[PDB]
Amino acid sequence: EFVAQISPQYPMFTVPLPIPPVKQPRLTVTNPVNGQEIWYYEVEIKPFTHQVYPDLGSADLVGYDGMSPGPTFQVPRGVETVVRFINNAEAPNSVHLHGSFSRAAFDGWAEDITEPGSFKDYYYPNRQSARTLWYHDHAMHITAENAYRGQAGLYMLTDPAEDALNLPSGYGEFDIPMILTSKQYTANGNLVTTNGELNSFWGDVIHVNGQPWPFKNVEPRKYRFRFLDAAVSRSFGLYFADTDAIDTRLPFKVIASDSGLLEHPADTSLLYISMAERYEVVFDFSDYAGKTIELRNLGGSIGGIGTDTDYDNTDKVMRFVVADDTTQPDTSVVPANLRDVPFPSPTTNTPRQFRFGRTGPTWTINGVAFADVQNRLLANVPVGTVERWELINAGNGWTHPIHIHLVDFKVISRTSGNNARTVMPYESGLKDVVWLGRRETVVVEAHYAPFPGVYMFHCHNLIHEDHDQMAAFNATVLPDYGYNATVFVDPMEELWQARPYELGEFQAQSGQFSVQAVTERIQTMAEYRPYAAADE
Ligand SMILES: *[C@@H]1O[C@H](CO)[C@@H](O[C@@H]2O[C@H](CO)[C@@H](O[C@H]3O[C@H](CO)[C@@H](O)[C@H](O)[C@@H]3O)[C@H](O)[C@H]2NC(C)=O)[C@H](O)[C@H]1NC(C)=O
Ligand SMILES: *[C@@H]1O[C@H](CO)[C@@H](O)[C@H](O)[C@H]1NC(C)=O
Ligand SMILES: [Ca+2]
Ligand SMILES: [Cu+2]
Ligand SMILES: [Cu+2]
Ligand SMILES: [Cu+2]
Ligand SMILES: [Cu+2]
């Protein structure tokens, strides 16, 4: 069963699915090292209001470029980017590009904050396999509220070599972002804050791309859906159902996970997806012409995998209204062979063990909280080592989607105390988040490479994360390793810290924001060659 909705009654499935706009670079800067162009962006973090409930008041948000989701980046492999994330808001931020093997000082270390009235330049490599990344806040102990209030957006890394696959295409056309969130609203339509919540903030209103229970008109053909669970605490068990047969799950194909394409499409009628996980789905509406297809969420706390509270309407995600015919023929396909997945060389070494539970009210990793500076560094791993980590949730009363920064990993095994599931077919490839459901233990395998530095790992339930379920590992190198490692291993390195800005120089695009100043700043950053070790 389920619990009565708390948020005001919403006009279900009446508002079109919005698509976040593509974020365009301001300019490009020539890299003196290799003559390549670096794309430079400016993102302004600022407050804004959004009228979510038509007949009530508005909600207070804070977002990248004053929208939520933030605008969508689209970057081809091989093009380095620099993003100046400008804090013109009211609380600190720390931006993490989730899915990117960024250097430690460009990775969103929780203490590596930018204050209101400052910005930080983030230098990204964009060398990894094509994948759906996302960028979001990571500031220590205020991550849940910063993300909740709007600081998360999509970042698509593209590969022209994947074009020949002829998958459904066109951002906002047949390649649709599906960013899920779960929130709660007050009686006059503002957001209920996550502040004060120490267990989980489930939310009773399901959003896609910032919009409660939307609809979309689709043609009877194939669409690529890029699912991201950007919720604070809600995990999903997604399925598609004709409204005439609301319990009957319709088949689809999963084609990609966190780190990129699967080797082969996974035939799927139920998609488990927890916080921070990305799955790309191809759904074929051609068998459902003139029907309405509802994207729904499995009840009973994601079919017994989770512990999430279910409400009146959290079994509903959005509705697809399928036309009777196409307007152009569908020439897209879903190849049986997608890519060769670059799995790490397998090891037989005993896995490191990490236990995710609670120590009193505080969510901990092996009994440690992230606030504990003395004890939070829980592993030293020489760069280039392949390690298995055993990620343990002994509890039946909570679940944890675990995220390890820097790496892509393979999911080796999952056990369940409730015998509920093992490794899912769509977990066949490479991932960077893995869901420890009720009484589940998962072993992952990862190459801790290619860059040395101190990095985070944590549960990505943002309430658990803030209080205080995060730890660090150090990917280590020897004194003679080179690659300017000495200025790239410490995430708090002063060279890369946030800088104060004057609002007027930003608006006037002068001073610190003149073409010359941005150019010289980026060329100087490029000279340190932060990502050279990936080009061996
Ligand atoms: C994470 O691992 C890093 C190694 O990859 C480590 O950095 C290393 O720290 C040691 C000790 O501070 C440095 O060794 C030398 O440091 C000074 C400077 O010359 C000397 O006076 C000392 O006697 C010692 O020989 C290494 O230079 C340094 N290596 C790099 C690449 O920076 C970090 O300390 C680790 N971070 C943690 C534990 O938080
Ligand atoms: C390290 O950074 C300095 C300063 O930008 C640069 O001159 C040098 O070429 C870099 N060395 C390596 C090995 O990246
Ligand atoms: Ca400072
Ligand atoms: Cu993340
Ligand atoms: Cu991450
Ligand atoms: Cu958790
Ligand atoms: Cu993180």
Q: How many A from CA of 487 to the centre of ligand 2? A: 10
Q: Which domains does the chain have, with CATH numbers?
A: 1-20+159-339 (2.60.40.420), 21-158+477-536 (2.60.40.420), 340-476 (2.60.40.420)
Ligand closest to 136 (CA) is 4
Cβ neighbours of residue 508 under 8 Å, at least 6 residues apart?
none
Q: How many A from CA of 486 to the centre of ligand 2? A: 11
Ligand closest to 383 (CA) is 1
Tokens of 271: 């998609």
Nearest CA among 181, 229, 141 for reference residue 469: 141
**Owner of token pair 């569908």:** 330
- What distance separates the 2 farthest-apart alpha carbons in the chain? 67
Name the residue with the closest Cα to ligand 1, atom 26.
479
Nearest CA among 111, 345, 338 for reference residue 224: 338
Judged on CB neighbours under 10 Å (0-12, 13-18, 19+), 350 is: exposed
Nearest CA among 206, 432, 222, 395 for reference residue 298: 206
**Owner of token pair 């070790």:** 533
Q: How many A from CA of 457 to the centre of ligand 7? A: 6
Name the residue with the closest Cα to ligand 2, atom 13.
483
Question: Ligand 1 atom closest to Cα of 472?
Answer: 39
Ligand closest to 101 (CA) is 5
Question: Ligand 1 atom closest to Cα of 452?
Answer: 5
What are the C-alpha distances in Å from 398 to residues 262, 306, 328, 362, 436?
A: 29, 7, 48, 13, 9
**Owner of token pair 């950007």:** 230
Residues within 5 Å of ion ligand 5, judged at the Cβ atom: 98, 405
Nearest CA among 292, 310, 290 for reference residue 300: 310
Tokens of 380: 């030293």
Tokens of 387: 């390690």
Judged on CB neighbours under 10 Å (0-12, 13-18, 19+), 163 is: exposed
Rounded Cα distance between 127 and 120, Å, is 22
Ligand closest to 465 (CA) is 6
Question: Ligand 2 atom closest to Cα of 532?
Answer: 14
What are the C-alpha distances in Å from 159 to residues 129, 188, 198?
A: 7, 45, 41
Rounded Cα distance between 502 and 513, Å, is 10
Question: Ligand 2 atom closest to Cα of 482?
Answer: 13
Cβ neighbours of residue 235 under 8 Å, at least 6 residues apart?
229, 272, 273, 274, 275, 302, 305, 306, 308, 399, 401, 435
Burial 440-453 (b: 16+ CB within 10 A, else e): bbbbbbbbbbbbbb
Burial 202-235 (b: 16+ CB within 10 A, else e): bbbbbbbbbbbbbbbebbbbbbbbbbbbbbbbbb
Pocket lining: 48 vs ligand 2, CB cutoff 6 Å: no
Tokens of 434: 């893995």
| Geometric angle at alpha carbon 172, from 167 and 174, rounded to 5° | 30
β-pair partners for 268: 252
Resolution of the solved structure (Å): 1.6
Per DSSP bridges, beta strands 236-242 and 292-297 are antiparallel
Rounded Cα distance between 100 and 104, Å, is 11
Pocket lining: 485 vs ligand 1, CB cutoff 6 Å: yes
Cβ neighbours of residue 7 under 8 Å, at least 6 residues apart?
183, 184, 185, 186, 192, 204, 205
Pocket lining: 477 vs ligand 1, CB cutoff 6 Å: yes
Name the residue with the closest Cα to ligand 1, atom 20.
479
Rounded Cα distance between 392 and 415, Å, is 10
Pocket lining: 478 vs ligand 1, CB cutoff 6 Å: no
**Owner of token pair 């930003």:** 506
Per DSSP bridges, beta strands 205-208 and 211-212 are antiparallel
Rounded Cα distance between 217 and 215, Å, is 7
Count of residues in the chain: 536
Pocket lining: 476 vs ligand 1, CB cutoff 6 Å: yes
**Containing H/E element for 506?**
helix 503-508
Residue 534: how many CA atoms within 13 Å on its side-chain side?
Answer: 24
**Containing H/E element for 319?**
strand 316-322
Ligand closest to 278 (CA) is 4
Q: How many A from CA of 377 to the centre of ligand 4? A: 19
Q: Are 82 and 41 in contact (CB under 8 A)?
A: yes
Rounded Cα distance between 246 and 237, Å, is 15
Pocket lining: 527 vs ligand 2, CB cutoff 6 Å: yes
Q: Are 452 and 485 in contact (CB under 8 A)?
A: yes
Rounded Cα distance between 113 and 93, Å, is 5
What are the C-alpha distances in Å from 497 to residues 81, 95, 122, 327, 487?
A: 17, 12, 10, 52, 12
Cα 357 to its chain centre, rounded Å, is: 23
Q: Are 458 and 136 in contact (CB under 8 A)?
A: no
Rounded Cα distance between 501 and 58, Å, is 30
Rounded Cα distance between 528 and 487, Å, is 9
Rounded Cα distance between 414 and 274, Å, is 15
Cβ neighbours of residue 524 under 8 Å, at least 6 residues apart?
none
What are the C-alpha distances in Å from 108 to residues 381, 472, 497?
A: 20, 13, 11
Q: How many A from CA of 483 to the centre of ligand 1? A: 14
Q: Are 142 and 168 in contact (CB under 8 A)?
A: no
Q: How many A from CA of 144 to the centre of ligand 5? A: 14
Cβ neighbour number for residue 358 with a 10 Å cutoff: 17
The DSSP 8-state label assigned to residue 368 in this structure reads B
Per DSSP bridges, beta strands 499-500 and 118-124 are antiparallel
Pocket lining: 529 vs ligand 2, CB cutoff 6 Å: yes
Tokens of 59: 């909600």
Alpha-carbon dihedral angle through residues 358, 359, 363, 366, given to the nearest 10 degrees: -90
Q: How many A from CA of 484 to the centre of ligand 5? A: 23
Name the residue with the closest Cα to ligand 1, atom 11.
479
Pocket lining: 454 vs ligand 1, CB cutoff 6 Å: yes
Q: How many A from CA of 101 to the centre of ligand 5? A: 9
Nearest CA among 97, 88, 74, 7 for reference residue 44: 88
Q: How many A from CA of 498 to the centre of ligand 3? A: 6
Sign of the alpha-carbon dihedral angle for 136, 118, 370, 410: positive
Pocket lining: 483 vs ligand 2, CB cutoff 6 Å: yes
Per DSSP bridges, beta strands 131-137 and 81-87 are unpaired
Residues within 5 Å of ion ligand 7, judged at the Cβ atom: 456
Pocket lining: 479 vs ligand 1, CB cutoff 6 Å: yes
**Containing H/E element for 364?**
strand 362-365
> Experimental method used, please?
X-ray
Pocket lining: 126 vs ligand 1, CB cutoff 6 Å: no
Nearest CA among 234, 280, 318 for reference residue 134: 280
The DSSP 8-state label assigned to residue 484 in this structure reads T
Pocket lining: 288 vs ligand 2, CB cutoff 6 Å: no
